[PDB]
Amino acid sequence: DNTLLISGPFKVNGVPLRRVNARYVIATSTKVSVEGVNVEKFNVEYFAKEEIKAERVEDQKVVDKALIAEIKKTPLLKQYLSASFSLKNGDKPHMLKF
Amino acid sequence: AESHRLYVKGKHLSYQRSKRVNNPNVSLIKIEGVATPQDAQFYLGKRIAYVYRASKEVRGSKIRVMWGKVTRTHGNSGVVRATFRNNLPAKTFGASVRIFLYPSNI
Amino acid sequence: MAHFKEYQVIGRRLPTESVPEPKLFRMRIFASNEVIAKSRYWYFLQKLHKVKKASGEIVSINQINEAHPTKVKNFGVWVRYDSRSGTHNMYKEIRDVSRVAAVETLYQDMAARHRARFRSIHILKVAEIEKTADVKRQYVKQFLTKDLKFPLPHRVQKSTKTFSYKRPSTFY
Amino acid sequence: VLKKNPLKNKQVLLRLNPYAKVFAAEKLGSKKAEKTGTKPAAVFTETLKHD
Amino acid sequence: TDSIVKASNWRLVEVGRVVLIKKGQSAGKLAAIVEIIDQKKVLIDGPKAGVPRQAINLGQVVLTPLTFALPRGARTATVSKKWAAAAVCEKWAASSWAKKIAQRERRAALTDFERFQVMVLRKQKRYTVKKALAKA
Amino acid sequence: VEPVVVIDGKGHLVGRLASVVAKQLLNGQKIVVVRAEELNISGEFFRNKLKYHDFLRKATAFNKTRGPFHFRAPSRIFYKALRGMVSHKTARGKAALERLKVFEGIPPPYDKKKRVVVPQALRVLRLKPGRKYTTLGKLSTSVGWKYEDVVAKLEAKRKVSSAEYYAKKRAFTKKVASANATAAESDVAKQLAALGY
RNA sequence: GGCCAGCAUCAGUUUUGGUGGCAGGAUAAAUCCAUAGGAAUGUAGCUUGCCUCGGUAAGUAUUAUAGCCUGUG
RNA sequence: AGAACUGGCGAUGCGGGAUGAACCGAACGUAGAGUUAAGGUGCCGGAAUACACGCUCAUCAGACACCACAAAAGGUGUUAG
RNA sequence: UUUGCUCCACACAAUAUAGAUGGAUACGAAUAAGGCGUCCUUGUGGCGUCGCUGAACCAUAGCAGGCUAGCAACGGUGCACUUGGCGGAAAGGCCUUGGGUGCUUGCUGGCGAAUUGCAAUGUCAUUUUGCGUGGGGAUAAAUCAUUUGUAUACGACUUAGA
């Protein structure tokens, strides 16, 4: 459904397996390897709708494990994810090479 | 942190106008950090919000918003045109608007 | 007029059963395009000989370019110009890289110093002076002086922001 | 009911003008020429460079 | 007891003066005054920088304090030769002004993660420096 | 961007500073102008004095209390020039002019704050060297302003106190430059140099 | 199934950019290279005074411990 | 005051000329988007305190059509011939 | 003069905002000149560097910024106190002493943050008023009327009266 799937990872910055939209994100240049992750399971039925579900929490754990493990392989990347973005004075988004 | 800002801060200038006529349906915006049309092209299509306050509590909030979106550049100096859903009431000449970074494309 | 160019316009009488192959005149015209070129051509031939665009023909419209657009030259220019109360002649000296450029700043010079327009100005001749000492104008000779060196005092920095924080200087 | 421009919309540009297909195939807007070794006469060059 | 005169040293326009094109196509590049045309026009050339040989205005360039040796009205290969034999690009990069230009460029080319890193390193440095200032 | 902008009219030209200021006010900026006694006008003194006298001849004949009001102080000469550039008979104009403030000297709230300049309004940049300029405190004194020496005494006092402040500031900045360039040998500082700092 | 919105894929009108290929001209002019000639806002060198070594003031010399202009290709 | 030929005001708004019956541009169904005319882009005022060449400093400057004025005559004032 | 008035602290209502959201970050003079640093025999001195603009500097990581356990260091910074000093041009601010208390992202770790369910300022500022609680504090005047005439068309002005 023309969406992006995301994880924080949830243990890193508190963001679970979540749907987002492409026109509401800044693609940075910083790239971990998705190789070694099993995200094919997920779908609009997963994120369907009618307290937290065991499927949701356990699947978050399973993705977080491998993803955090790959994230250790880069210095200060965990702390980068833990931090939040904010525009400071003089920051001009049309000249920030994200 | 100290900051929580994901919006560029701009100013509402006059409406689109001649010397002696105005079009309320198009407002002119000055985006901070923007002094060229080639830079304003980044901000085309971006959402604008004028946030204001009122005494009457309407749905949990005393704060109200007018949404708009950038449409084209205006002039040579980075000034920009915007068109809001319900136009800006002209009391806001010199007031501050919030140019957001969505719809994003980098 | 505009950013000028130099053309040769070659032109002719319309051939007749009496006179086939007429004499083929030519002019070096300074103009920003071929249209103004051919127009000036018929202007000056309609002065000089019994011809007009109706009774005549344009045989060639060719562009002339500087052989050396990077060598600095000292041009003499002979001018005729209609003033308000009278018409006069002139010689001028222009140190520049090209004839088109010299003639451009000439038209500007005449506009500024004598309030003369493109319509008033003819260009009698434009000629590079091979050697110094055949120059007659101090405002070219003083740059022809040897070992030339000068500063540009009082350097102004064009600002971007409308508020500064430094109280600038003019060092240079 | 609605006019559609060719030069966008290849579909109308192809119902009009069948030849646009092969024009695009052979590209026929960047057709390279055959190079000829002609030189202008000395009379021409002298006239062009005459004072 | 001798006479005192400051004289206000300027950087001059002269055959050999090396300029910094700031606007145009070149626009941030080095060139050299081959010949002087008028109070405002000079013929410049930088062949190592790609700069074509051309007349330009002294307000469209800015002079540099660097200077090398050229004879009047020299051709493009000659000025390339003497440029290299003076090795003046090395001097310009040695300058504290080229460094500032590159500082601006790098700061611009920074990404969000390099910028977070900059931040962390600055916090560490200021910890050290404020500790050292409490002492001296 | 800054909430209040304290401009220092020393060296500035009245009209150019005035137009810059007016537009900032209308765009919605608080500007306060200080040291307007040091503000410059182009041309010579006698000229600008005559222009003032021409303005001074003008007066509603049947009641000169109704007439144009000829303010003498440099701050008010500036205000006159600038209200000519604002649409001042509107609510919007009034609001802009309330965002504005003007002073002879640098009074107590703004002597401890930074002052700024406007390069498109500065005499030294704009005017060609040679051309004669005028000084507005001298003009104002000639056409009636009284308090040119009170401002001079108070500014002498202020300059003393500020020079002492700057001595302290400069000493501490020497200390800090020492403390920084001793630490531009660490791996962290070389990493900063790599990244651009 | 009513009001207010968002994304994608399309149609029409339009605006602002990035980029590729091709032709014409003196089949750009130049630059660059080669070649002939030339001089000077005369380079090296030489001759003569000043000469605190050094460089200067002239004379010669036109490529030499720098270059330049012109013509041809 | 009176004729000739066209074009207009009258009878007609809109954009510009501050302002104006007739000048410039363009003629009017209700809207919306884009592009422009004339005129303009310091601020009043939408849009460059733009780029470039030069002239002028007025102890009476000058600032663009209709148009709301200035002449003869003079000046080792400055600039070019 | 009803157990009213005022200042401070808190709590609750309403009142709107010419319009916050990382920081208004302090020499002065010059512009055909200066700033910074250094040295001396302290000047209109020598030497060096800088400027070509604030795209600078400071700050800025954490449930709108949570709870935790340590390592290093004796630093930074918030609050309520507190020592002294300076500042009247509209000072009402600038600096500084001592400790109490917290936080520290200077470094390394643990837990948590999910459903706002693909975005909707998603409220996290300032001003004023009013009833209410805890306390402290002060506890008069004017006008009408009478009166006077240095005053007066009427108002007003000048005067007096326990």
Swiss-Prot record, chain A:
PTM: N-terminally acetylated by acetyltransferase NatA.
Location in or out of the cell: Cytoplasm
Main localization category: cytoplasm
GO molecular function per UniProt: RNA binding; structural constituent of ribosome
Subunit relationships: Component of the large ribosomal subunit (LSU). Mature yeast ribosomes consist of a small (40S) and a large (60S) subunit. The 40S small subunit contains 1 molecule of ribosomal RNA (18S rRNA) and 33 different proteins (encoded by 57 genes). The large 60S subunit contains 3 rRNA molecules (25S, 5.8S and 5S rRNA) and 46 different proteins (encoded by 81 genes).
Protein's job: Component of the ribosome, a large ribonucleoprotein complex responsible for the synthesis of proteins in the cell. The small ribosomal subunit (SSU) binds messenger RNAs (mRNAs) and translates the encoded message by selecting cognate aminoacyl-transfer RNA (tRNA) molecules. The large subunit (LSU) contains the ribosomal catalytic site termed the peptidyl transferase center (PTC), which catalyzes the formation of peptide bonds, thereby polymerizing the amino acids delivered by tRNAs into a polypeptide chain.
Similarity field: Belongs to the eukaryotic ribosomal protein eL6 family.
Protein name as annotated: Large ribosomal subunit protein eL6A
Gene encoding the protein: RPL6A
From Swiss-Prot, chain B:
SUPFAM superfamilies: Translation proteins
Signal sequence residues: none
Gene3D superfamilies: translation elongation factor selb, chain A, domain 4
InterPro entries per record: Ribosomal_eL33 (IPR001780), Ribosomal_eL33_CS (IPR018266), Ribosomal_eL33_sf (IPR038661), Transl_B-barrel_sf (IPR009000)
Localization per record: Cytoplasm
Placement of covalent cross-link Glycyl lysine isopeptide (Lys-Gly) (interchain with G-Cter in ubiquitin): K46
Domain of life according to the entry: Eukaryota
UniProt similarity note: Belongs to the eukaryotic ribosomal protein eL33 family.
Further remark: There are 2 genes for eL33 in yeast.
Quaternary structure (record): Component of the large ribosomal subunit (LSU). Mature yeast ribosomes consist of a small (40S) and a large (60S) subunit. The 40S small subunit contains 1 molecule of ribosomal RNA (18S rRNA) and 33 different proteins (encoded by 57 genes). The large 60S subunit contains 3 rRNA molecules (25S, 5.8S and 5S rRNA) and 46 different proteins (encoded by 81 genes).
Reported function: Component of the ribosome, a large ribonucleoprotein complex responsible for the synthesis of proteins in the cell. The small ribosomal subunit (SSU) binds messenger RNAs (mRNAs) and translates the encoded message by selecting cognate aminoacyl-transfer RNA (tRNA) molecules. The large subunit (LSU) contains the ribosomal catalytic site termed the peptidyl transferase center (PTC), which catalyzes the formation of peptide bonds, thereby polymerizing the amino acids delivered by tRNAs into a polypeptide chain.
Protein name stated in the entry: Large ribosomal subunit protein eL33A
Curated annotation (Swiss-Prot), chain C:
Protein name, entry field: Large ribosomal subunit protein eL20A
Cross-link type Glycyl lysine isopeptide (Lys-Gly) (interchain with G-Cter in ubiquitin), residue numbers: K125, K131, K149
Keywords assigned by UniProt, alphabetized: Cytoplasm, Isopeptide bond, Phosphoprotein, Ribonucleoprotein, Ribosomal protein, Ubl conjugation
Native species: Saccharomyces cerevisiae (strain ATCC 204508 / S288c) (Baker's yeast)
Entry-linked Pfam families: Ribosomal_L18A
Primary role: Component of the ribosome, a large ribonucleoprotein complex responsible for the synthesis of proteins in the cell. The small ribosomal subunit (SSU) binds messenger RNAs (mRNAs) and translates the encoded message by selecting cognate aminoacyl-transfer RNA (tRNA) molecules. The large subunit (LSU) contains the ribosomal catalytic site termed the peptidyl transferase center (PTC), which catalyzes the formation of peptide bonds, thereby polymerizing the amino acids delivered by tRNAs into a polypeptide chain.
GO cellular component: a single term: cytosol
Disulfide bonds: none
Modification type Phosphoserine: residues: S32
Misc remark: Present with 54300 molecules/cell in log phase SD medium.
Cellular localisation: Cytoplasm
GO biological process: cytoplasmic translation
Annotated family: Belongs to the eukaryotic ribosomal protein eL20 family.
Any GO MF annotation of the entry: structural constituent of ribosome
Gene behind this protein: RPL20A
From Swiss-Prot, chain F:
Keyword Ribonucleoprotein: yes
Subcellular location: Cytoplasm
Keywords in alphabetical order: Acetylation, Cytoplasm, Isopeptide bond, Ribonucleoprotein, Ribosomal protein, Ubl conjugation
GO molecular function: mRNA binding; RNA binding; structural constituent of ribosome
Glycyl lysine isopeptide (Lys-Gly) (interchain with G-Cter in ubiquitin) crosslink residues: K175
Entry GO CC: cytosol; cytosolic large ribosomal subunit; nucleolus; ribosome
GO-annotated biological processes: cytoplasmic translation; maturation of LSU-rRNA; negative regulation of translation
Alphabetical list of Pfam families matching this protein: Ribosomal_L13
Modifications made to the protein after synthesis: N-terminally acetylated by acetyltransferase NatA.
Main location as per UniProt: cytoplasm
PANTHER family, per the entry: LARGE RIBOSOMAL SUBUNIT PROTEIN UL13 (PTHR11545:SF3), RIBOSOMAL PROTEIN L13 (PTHR11545)
Subunit structure comment from the entry: Component of the large ribosomal subunit (LSU). Mature yeast ribosomes consist of a small (40S) and a large (60S) subunit. The 40S small subunit contains 1 molecule of ribosomal RNA (18S rRNA) and 33 different proteins (encoded by 57 genes). The large 60S subunit contains 3 rRNA molecules (25S, 5.8S and 5S rRNA) and 46 different proteins (encoded by 81 genes).
Family designation: Belongs to the universal ribosomal protein uL13 family.
Misc: Present with 43300 molecules/cell in log phase SD medium.
Protein name per UniProt: Large ribosomal subunit protein uL13A
Annotated source species: Saccharomyces cerevisiae (strain ATCC 204508 / S288c)
Gene: RPL16A
